Design a protein around this ligand. Structure first.
Ligand code: 8JX
Length: 136
């Protein structure tokens, strides 16, 4: 197999900035103690691609997570904050668009390459948080 456009996400990334994540988590419904501890985390994210399967791992002092998925194909995800959600991730104009659905609610997480950074934009009900990762 040769290159894929998604290979631009592949690598080891470290969180360097976070804006409005507490308010985003509030909107998602995250409880106090989880918000405080999760908010402190400075995770590393490892993204790899193997055939049609994309894997996103996150390692931090808060929680270690891993999701593997095929674009456009819904999967079960247990989030860092312990929600059990139905997730679908697609590629739209170079941007990984990740929708999580649970308990009649929905949130969208966009991951995109900007310069040498990987920018993560999380949106829930008018509230947006921006998290920026750099190469590790
Ligand atoms: C470190 O704490 C978290 C990580 C990921 C998630 S998530 O379910 O994967 N949605 C956010 C995804 C992008 C954030 C990031 O990877 O830096 C959390 C969701 C709610 C509260 C805390 C979360």
């Amino acid at each position: 197999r040769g290159s894929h456009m998604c290979d631009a996400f592949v690598g080891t990334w470290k969180l360097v900035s976070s804006e409005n994540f507490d308010d985003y988590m509030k909107e998602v419904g995250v409880g106090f103690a989880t918000r405080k501890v999760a908010g402190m985390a400075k995770p590393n994210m490892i993204i790899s691609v193997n055939g049609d399967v994309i894997t996103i791992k996150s390692e931090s002092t808060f929680k270690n997570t891993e999701i593997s998925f095929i674009l456009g194909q819904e999967f079960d995800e247990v989030t860092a904050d312990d929600r059990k959600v139905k997730s679908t991730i697609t590629l739209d104009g170079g941007v990984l668009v990740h929708v999580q659905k649970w308990d009649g609610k929905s949130t969208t997480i966009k991951r995109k390459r900007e310069d040498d950074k990987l920018v993560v934009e999380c949106v829930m009900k008018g509230v947006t948080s921006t998290r920026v990762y750099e190469r590790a």
